Curated annotation (Swiss-Prot), chains A, D, E:
The keyword DNA damage does not apply. The lineage of its organism: Viruses, Riboviria, Orthornavirae, Duplornaviricota, Resentoviricetes. It comes from Rotavirus A (strain RVA/Monkey/United States/RRV/1975/G3P5B[3]) (RV-A). This is Intermediate capsid protein VP6. Pfam families: Rota_Capsid_VP6 (PF00980). GO terms for cellular component: T=13 icosahedral viral capsid; viral envelope; viral intermediate capsid. The N-terminus is blocked. Sumoylated with SUMO1 and SUMO2. Sumoylation of viral proteins seems to have a positive role on viral replication. The keyword Nucleus does not apply. Ca(2+) binds at residues 266, 286. Intermediate capsid protein that self assembles to form an icosahedral capsid with a T=13 symmetry, which consists of 230 trimers of VP6, with channels at each of its five-fold vertices. This capsid constitutes the middle concentric layer of the viral mature particle. The innermost VP2 capsid and the intermediate VP6 capsid remain intact following cell entry to protect the dsRNA from degradation and to prevent unfavorable antiviral responses in the host cell during all the replication cycle of the virus.
Length: 396, 49, 397, 396, 396, 133
């Protein structure tokens, strides 16, 4: 993985720095690394596999070295370099694609393609140089048993789930108390609804609680907490738990009461925010607990008092909502996010070449199923393919 | 590696391989004899060195 | 860690092998290792213990080398070596204790005490020699990220949980169908009860299922499965789920029917055992699914028929049990088990010096809390402290 | 076997002792042994697998010798050694796995795999060195016809059997006299029941006897005796002997009377324990004879006298229990036990590669069938596979 | 003891390492130690036996040294070594047996057999080399007056005692309040019973206490505490304290209330756990105090309410049980446990040769008597014989 | 114990035999034994412990040898010997008291106090002489 990344970085630096008219001193070390790569790769035969519709490809290396004796690079130098760079880039891209479409259950972090296993031999360790990208840096740190983290903007940590819980219900669905929620990507929208507006509740308060258990620990997370859930703020016709019938939801939005957002790690409260909205920081957590209350307003103007009668029928249903958006976070493990293209690249390569479903990932690299069952084997394979995808992104 | 063999002085592996006719490659800058005689090839003198 | 282990190993070998009258040829390499240790440690200052009631100890090393001119070891040689060994063993004990009482949320696998941090320098790496203990071997494999393995006799994998589930119930609690289980340590006792004895069941079969999720994957596990659960086979008065009232459990034990033990990894069937009792092997699994049926006996003697009427009241309740004991297993992570004393040693040191509750471990080293929420950071810290405890047990114990 | 064990132990010592910074004097002898192994193995071709789903693997040895350092080993030395050690460990693990999945009715003690058969040639005897483990020591002793000894914590010596015997019975199963027992693993739990409570028995004594025939002789055995059998102390509905009907058991537990444990060897009484509970020692035996009695209490309080009428119906049935637990023992043969993993390892290897059932062991390596019919050929094959499993555990 | 252990260790290493084909480099130091042992033992006459049926045996040592000029060991060398090894192993086994069957009151730590007393001479200390086993290590620590430590899996620290105490009793034994317990090995089951279900109790709570005194201090102990005593949860007829009559017990189990286990050292509370079940750690203690409560359920279903009437008769008797199992511990003294075999070895040797009862140990080496009255003299003799047994187990 | 007894015996014999005017032939062997004791004890630090209310006491030994070359012992000789003997007797009494107040369940025949354990080393065996009581 370090050798593949080093090939990719050498080729990227060659593309960026070997340009006409540039001082050789601007590229001297790069040319030394490029010639080292050529020498190490010369005389070796490689095969990128026939998995799926990806064609079997054979690669040979009998390239000469680049010149080192000009003061400024000229057109001949750039053309001669480009001829070798194209072949090397094609080989690296094919090796990355071959590695991206393979997976293993026993050892998913180890190389899967024959090309990358060959490149892991000692004879290629000479190609290795600067490992500065975030993914390769994390890979090397983790091989060292060192604490390392990936930084995500809008991490995709929540499997998609639009669901509800009815703590009070009946076959006609006209006096309902419960919670509605959407956990999607980096976003949680939750809403507790009471059809009676806590008319017959102790102290005229109805308590709602929503626990979201993250599949991986998040650290130094910036979160936006807003006091309303616009997703559950308009009339809806909603299936029942068994789908036998459909019920009616007609929210009237009240301010949530006694809002407590707890970020917990191993069941212990790490961060607690009471009646705080805006930007909050969750330093280290694996669980989110949102407690809120629907408080019947003690005083109501006649228009308000009309909405909430003493008994049924309840035509206006009192709802209190919370919205929790994870803008940024850090994770030990790899995750899809709104900014990085690793998941998209891997899925695209797997779709283009009609890669059959393997024993590790779900069909189509579907992220909801993947993150729902984020097993250690899935984590290993997913980090491997994401690192290979980042390596491929440097050139493709 | 012939340089490493010279520097160590441990000839146990090379001796064991030469005694047991174990295929090997001796690597290092070596002088060689250019033999143009077919009879030398038939006599197998390259294996006697 | 490797340097601390090597110090402890050198000291234990010196205590065992530097004995009066022994041939110098029996200890020559050991004497060289001991003198290497002395040379490396000489001129270095160490400080151990500023946490809880653990005293601040300052350690200075200015020792002479053991001689090498003897052909047999005599009394004076052994006594001088013993003096040096006693000082070194005291130092190693204190360093181990200092490391065991500390924890980090970030790099729990890394050294936490300043003495071990100092021992992590290059100059001390010369002390490193044979790393043959199971814990240090696993430590070195884990550092390179090779497949680790810890063998546990009666692994403490199940957090304590005595609870029940009622599938059929009502406020009088006179016609109940459900399961009650104890998952404790290496044992699962489960029992499905039907008060009606499946009189109105679909073909007089009542199916019971119990799923136990292990917090870590176990491999090469020897498991005893016995048909009956003696823990849920006598009259009991059991609190209701809400604790509002109490109900009565008067079981009569019938053999379980169509017993199926399923050992699954990542929700995939690895091992399946049907109607098999005694010793079984679960080669690689993280979930146990025990499914068993209460089958109403078609033919009953007059007493048995008197036990189970056609309708309520049901005075005798039909119960089918199962006992599962993990005798031995292998886990890639450290665990408490019956045979070892690592958890006991760490807890004993932490309690002896009133170590305040840290950000990593539960409030007192409670194993149920730890195994219930066995997080990667907790795993790193636990492995570190357990390896230090095993190092200390070589000398202090 | 001794050569395979020596290879495995050389590799284990190389992994444990060849560590960065160690004095070369700490490894000199180990380095000499390792280089001798390299010399002896180089130029030899080995093949493993070809049975079940165990893959065919080809092994070639063309390694150079480990060098020397003046004072202390460095990182370069450790990596160079570790490459060779990793290859050799892979080879040894594969050879052990190939040997564990094979069996032979004839010469079950002899090597069955081609790799181990080749390793038994004279040329490889050079590799042989310290045979200090318990299993290899017993292997050599058995080769020399010396007395072998395996120490087992909680030996798995009793095949699972939950059975009962009715000495007095009739189709209504309301006045029953007999015994019910569980012989499982290292545990015997027996209980003698009389429904009449020995009202008509001579001297008001009912004599119960249980005999367990161990399939192998156990020596130096620590055994716990407890008066009661908790497994047969609660009411239960029990199938008929032919399964035609079910009967009812409603135990009331009385102290077993005149308890006598006899540990016998070849029909001769070796150890006798009378009314002794707690820890006892059986020095050498192959048969256990537990004789106990239900003695009707001559004096009864009214509550007690109520349970035991002069005649039928009998609603409370008198039961006297007995629990025997072999905590540790020594056997001349190999057995599964609670502390080791040999049986688990062999079964796991056979199941992982879907090894077809052979003519020696029962399907799935089930221990109840294996110990029920523990033939000398089964003993030889099981000792071979257990020794190979112990050799493999040194490395894997 | 150290010389006898060194003889045994040299012989064991000779058996393990002097094998055909091994490099002389692997055994050079061992061969030197073996020749030193021959030199030291030559010209010395020993006599073992003469106690019980252990036969009198005379031992003469006149042996040649082993060669030192081989490169690899061959068959001739191994047989020449094996003859001497056989004689020496027989001598060591007989010396160990002669020592195991003897005891003294004043100085039981010192050697008792004339052979071992002769081996304690200064001239034999030349034989002494590596003392690495746990028992010899503790022997040397004891001889140096250092702190000793023995690890025990399931230490046999509790003498067998199945007893009960009735705090409320009548001649008819129909309204009984008390507690019954079994202490056995590493296990303590206790059960407090109230026949009236604490109806007349002050707060409808009955307090039960159980104090168990350990005959030795246990440190670093891991214990499992469970909330039910299955041993006292079934109906049984129990003898009266005087044996004059028998009473009836018909348990109905309620969960124990305010469970409090205290581990005390010299009357000082070292550890305390309240309402804690599962694995607990007792770091240093000599007494266990289990205090629990039977709390009458304030709310009862009609069946539960039927179980417990206002007044007599009481047919269902409320019971609360505790189970306490010591799985592992450390003790400064030797104890029989489930994993070791020293007690079994000593008892077997004493039984096989019909050793008359001595003035130190109880007849038959019965462990309950030994641990009930574990005096310092008994501890000395037991440590001596256990160390000798461990030495013997190295060879036999 | 034999070394402690020998110290006490040497001191008692010195107190009884080193008297003014006595012939040196009456004490020659005694003087040799006393000087042997002084040589063996010189340069050694001892501590009698603080068990109970027994005070912690430290003992240092740097004494000159008792002289020879007198036909009859004089007052100067007896005075010097008495100073040394007084210090030694105080040390021996304190060691005996420290040993008398200690006990062990096992190995209770062995010395318990640190001073007597130190005295049980080989280097003090030279002090040992007639064990007649
Ligand atoms: Cl156990
Ligand atoms: Zn609904
Ligand atoms: Zn309920
Ligand atoms: Zn029948
Ligand atoms: Zn055990
Ligand atoms: Zn009574």
């Amino acid at each position: 993985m370090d050798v593949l990344y080093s090939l990719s970085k050498t080729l990227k630096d060659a593309r960026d720095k070997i340009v006409e008219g540039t001082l050789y001193s601007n590229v001297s070390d790069l040319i030394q690394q490029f010639n080292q790569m050529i020498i190490t790769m010369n005389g070796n035969e490689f095969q990128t596999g026939g998995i799926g519709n990806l064609p079997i490809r054979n690669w040979n290396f009998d390239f000469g070295l680049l010149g080192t004796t000009l003061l400024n690079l000229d057109a001949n130098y750039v053309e001669t370099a480009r001829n070798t760079i194209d072949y090397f880039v094609d080989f690296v891209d094919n090796v990355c694609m071959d590695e991206m479409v393979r997976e293993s259950q026993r050892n998913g972090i180890a190389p899967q393609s024959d090309s990358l296993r060959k490149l892991s031999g000692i004879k290629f360790k000479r190609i290795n140089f600067d490992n500065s990208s975030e993914y390769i840096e994390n890979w090397n740190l983790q091989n060292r048993r060192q604490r390392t983290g990936f930084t995500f903007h809008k991490p995709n940590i929540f499997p998609y789930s639009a669901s509800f819980t009815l703590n009070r219900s009946q076959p006609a669905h006209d006096n309902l108390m419960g919670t509605m929620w959407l956990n999607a990507g980096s976003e949680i929208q939750v809403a507790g609804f009471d059809y009676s507006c806590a008319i017959n509740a102790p102290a005229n308060i109805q308590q709602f609680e929503h626990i979201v258990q993250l599949r991986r620990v998040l650290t130094t997370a910036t979160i936006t907490l807003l006091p309303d859930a616009e997703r559950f703020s308009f009339p809806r016709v909603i299936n029942s738990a068994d789908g036998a019938t459909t019920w009616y939801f007609n929210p009237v939005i009240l301010r949530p009461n006694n809002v407590e957002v707890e970020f917990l790690l191993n069941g212990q409260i790490i961060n607690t925010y009471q009646a705080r909205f805006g930007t909050i920081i969750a330093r280290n957590f694996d669980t989110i607990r949102l407690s809120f209350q629907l408080m019947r307003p003690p005083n109501m103007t006649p228009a308000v008092a009309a909405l909430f009668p003493n008994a049924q029928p309840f035509e206006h249903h009192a709802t209190v909502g919370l919205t929790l958006r994870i803008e940024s976070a850090v994770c030990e493990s790899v995750l899809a996010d709104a900014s990085k293209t690793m998941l998209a690249n891997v899925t695209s390569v797997r779709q283009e070449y009609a890669i059959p479903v393997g024993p590790v990932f779900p069909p189509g690299m579907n992220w909801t199923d993947l993150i729902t069952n984020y097993s250690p084997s899935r984590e290993d394979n997913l980090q491997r393919v994401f690192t290979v995808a980042s390596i491929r992104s440097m050139l493709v | 590696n012939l340089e490493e063999l010279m520097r160590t002085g441990d000839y146990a592996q090379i001796t064991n391989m030469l005694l047991n006719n174990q295929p090997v490659a001796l690597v290092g800058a070596l002088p060689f004899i250019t033999d143009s005689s077919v009879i030398s090839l038939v006599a197998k003198l390259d294996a006697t060195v």
